[PDB]
Structure 1
Amino acid sequence: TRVFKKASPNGKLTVYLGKRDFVDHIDLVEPVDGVVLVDPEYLKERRVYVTLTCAFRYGREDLDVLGLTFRKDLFVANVQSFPPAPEDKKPLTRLQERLIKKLGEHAYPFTFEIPPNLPCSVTLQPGPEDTGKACGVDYEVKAFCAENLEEKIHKRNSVRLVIRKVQYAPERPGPQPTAETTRQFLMSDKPLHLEASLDKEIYYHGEPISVNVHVTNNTNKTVKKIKISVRQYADICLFNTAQYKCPVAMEEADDTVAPSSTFCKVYTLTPFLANNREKRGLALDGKLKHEDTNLASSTLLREGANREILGIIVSYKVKVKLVVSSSDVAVELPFTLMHPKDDDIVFEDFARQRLKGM
């Protein structure tokens, strides 16, 4: 198996994790299980704590930065790690029992269980024009040395790292999302009927989207061309609320539909951050420089749910449009964008792999 790790500036403390992206379903959220490597001597009476903060920040580009103009803590979890507190004691994963047995006795566990209905790691990076500042919700894991809880944490023997809460939806049976509209122009009751659908409700980053477009033209006009698009919507709803709208995929085609005939076709779009990187105002599931970053996924929420508490609400839509030689006739279908997903361990850094940038 493979596990990531990171050490404190003075290598006296070292965190060990088997993932840096925790997959949350709806029922449950993969548990955040890791262990610390301590130097009992180095810290006399001092202790080892590990905390999981979940918060929304606005202004800077991360929680640890001291230039953000707003912050709301959405979750916090502290655990007395070194001095094993019989109180704060749990069952233990296997990657743990495994790890502890390779690190020794100075190996100590900790485990965090993230409530199912908390927002997922989402970051919205403002453009050049946009008057808003960056913001997002991040999960910070911090293990540190101190006697009491409160003493002053020092960047010296403390370690910090951002993990990720990614959303996965299993794809159900349901009907394909449909949308239709009829249009009658000036001086005639002859209609132009549009109707589209997507092959399914749930998609995953990188997974293609198929659009079945059917056009019934009883009109005496002509459909010049057809434009298919996939837009993203981001509603920052906390410090300084605003709504960002951004296209993540377009596919215009010179398809023609003659007077009194029926048209039919299947288009394929692929929303990919790669072909949008140089864009801004959109929401991502991380920072741009990181390679393992995608487009922010659809914010889920159902019945009596607090919307502000989620930070940034994200949604997607596919728009179909016919340019008729005017007023185009169009429809739109909403979809959900989700996330995919005798050993030997072998530690590896925690830092997220980078891009290519000049």
Structure 2
Amino acid sequence: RVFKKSSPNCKLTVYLGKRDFVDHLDKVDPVDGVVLVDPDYLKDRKVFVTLTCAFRYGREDLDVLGLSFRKDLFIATYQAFPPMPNPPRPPTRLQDRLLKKLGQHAHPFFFTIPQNLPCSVTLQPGPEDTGKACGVDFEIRAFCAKSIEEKSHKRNSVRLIIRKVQFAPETPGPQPSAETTRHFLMSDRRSLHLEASLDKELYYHGEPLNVNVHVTNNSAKTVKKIRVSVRQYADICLFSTAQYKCPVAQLEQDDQVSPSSTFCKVYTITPLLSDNREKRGLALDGQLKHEDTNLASSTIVKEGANKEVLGILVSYRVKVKLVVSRGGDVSVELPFVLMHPKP
């Protein structure tokens, strides 16, 4: 369903199809819709429309009264109401549905997004920090100032948040597996080779996590337990990079094992949202103002760019942790990535 945003001056209105836009791989999801303006107030007053890719990392007026502000990683510009001779050679089916239900004054717009823009992702705040903020987002405005598109202001500017969520490649990549050995203080017997063999690389929202963990044993230091705990990496790039480890979901059974041979259990994790709902510090996919979101997708960084990628660069991992007599809490980690499938 289409939705409009209206300014209290009933001058500009913006009609759009979807707030969530699909970041395809080969392409992006472009914007469609129209801007409906009224001609009586708008006499020789020329409207524009824009797409601001933006990066928020704190307070509005505070971090501004310094030497810098948010780096708008991108800003689109296209000229509405006086179209230099009417140049929308392709219109859109949404615009076809809008132009005829709405009046003769509706002005179409359409926004190509450069894909060197990361996604709309925000940190999960603490419980106690009240005025603290950060996150990447995509917003779009309709506006007009008397001065040409370079200068702009408020009061006619019509806001709207949108999103650009990332989507998965066809290729999953390798068969990632960790299988390795440790060395000790008071049992030189080798006690744990451990093979966290797996089945897939890039999952989606609702496909469980079976870790085929094959322990190899020689004798001593009886192992108590083996938990499998999914490690979300909460990346931040503000002035330094930053992770905040915290397990989204972790499960375990008491399958106990013996000295001088090999065991193997498949341990199955399911990371849910509503179980980590009302919890601190879990990167979630963006939302539309109240509507139900999910856990954040893994963000990936391009293989060499000029400027380091700033934002929440979400990644995950199944940490595989054990408890061993008399209770050493010991594990390992791997790489693996969570994304979307793309309409």
Is the pair's TM-score, using the shorter chain for normalization, greater than 0.5? yes
Amino acid at match of 1:163: I
Report SS of the residue matched to 1:96. helix
In the other structure, the counterpart of 2:207 is 207
Aligned pair in 2 of structure 1 residues 129, 217: CA closer, same or farther (>3 Å)? Answer: farther
Q: Within 5 Å, which residues of 2 pair with 1:140-151?
A: 140-148=139-147, 149=149
Percent identical residues: 76
Aligned pair in 2 of structure 1 residues 320, 303: CA closer, same or farther (>3 Å)? Answer: same
Amino acid at match of 2:114: P
Deviations for 1:45-74, whole angstroms, at most 9, x for unmatched residues?
1122111111111213xxxx5455541110
Deviations for 1:250-274, whole angstroms, at most 9, x for unmatched residues?
1132221122343222222222332
Aligned pair in 2 of structure 1 residues 187, 217: CA closer, same or farther (>3 Å)? Answer: closer
In the other structure, the counterpart of 2:252 is 252
Deviations for 1:321-350, whole angstroms, at most 9, x for unmatched residues?
222215445222221111244xxxxxxxxx
In the other structure, the counterpart of 1:333 is 334
Please, which moves more after superposition, 265-274 or 227-236? Answer: 265-274
Q: Within 5 Å, which residues of 2 pair with 1:269-308?
A: 269-286=269-286, 290-306=290-306, 308=308
In the other structure, the counterpart of 1:172 is 171
| Aligned partners of 1:20 and 1:163 also within 8 Å | yes
Deviations for 1:180-208, whole angstroms, at most 9, x for unmatched residues?
12235434334422111332111223432
Report SS of the residue matched to 1:333. coil
Is structure 2 residue 84 aligned with structure 1 residue 114?
Answer: no
Aligned pair in 2 of structure 1 residues 134, 329: CA closer, same or farther (>3 Å)? Answer: same
Q: Distance in 1 between matches of 2:242 and 2:35?
A: 41
In the other structure, the counterpart of 1:347 is none
Q: CA deviation at 1:165?
A: 0.8
Q: Distance in 1 between matches of 2:308 and 2:131?
A: 17
Q: CA deviation at 1:243?
A: 2.8
Please, which moves more after superposition, 40-49 or 282-291? Answer: 282-291
In the other structure, the counterpart of 2:97 is 98
Is structure 2 residue 69 aligned with structure 1 residue 76?
Answer: no
Q: CA deviation at 1:158?
A: 2.8
In the other structure, the counterpart of 2:316 is 316
TM-score, normalising length: structure 1: 0.84
Q: Distance in 2 between matches of 1:184 and 1:213?
A: 19
| Aligned partners of 1:53 and 1:141 also within 8 Å | yes
Aligned pair in 2 of structure 1 residues 68, 125: CA closer, same or farther (>3 Å)? Answer: farther
Amino acid at match of 1:79: Y
Q: Distance in 2 between matches of 1:84 and 1:333?
A: 54
Please, which moves more after superposition, 124-133 or 104-113? Answer: 124-133
Q: Distance in 2 between matches of 1:126 and 1:175?
A: 34
Q: Distance in 2 between matches of 1:230 and 1:162?
A: 31
Q: CA deviation at 1:247?
A: 1.4
Is structure 2 residue 161 aligned with structure 1 residue 158?
Answer: no
Q: Distance in 2 between matches of 1:309 and 1:210?
A: 32
Root mean square deviation of aligned Cα: 2.7
| Aligned partners of 2:54 and 2:137 also within 8 Å | yes
In the other structure, the counterpart of 1:345 is none
| Aligned partners of 1:5 and 1:16 also within 8 Å | yes
Larger relative strand fraction: 1
| Aligned partners of 1:43 and 1:145 also within 8 Å | no
Unaligned runs of 5+ in 1: 342-358
TM-score, normalising length: structure 2: 0.87
Amino acid at match of 1:324: V
Report SS of the residue matched to 1:100. helix
Amino acid at match of 2:283: A
Aligned pair in 2 of structure 1 residues 132, 320: CA closer, same or farther (>3 Å)? Answer: farther
Report SS of the residue matched to 2:56. strand
Amino acid at match of 1:217: N
Aligned pair in 2 of structure 1 residues 290, 180: CA closer, same or farther (>3 Å)? Answer: farther
Q: Distance in 1 between matches of 2:210 and 2:141?
A: 43
Deviations for 1:239-297, whole angstroms, at most 9, x for unmatched residues?
46433222111113222112234322222222233222333233333269633323322
Please, which moves more after superposition, 137-146 or 82-91? Answer: 82-91
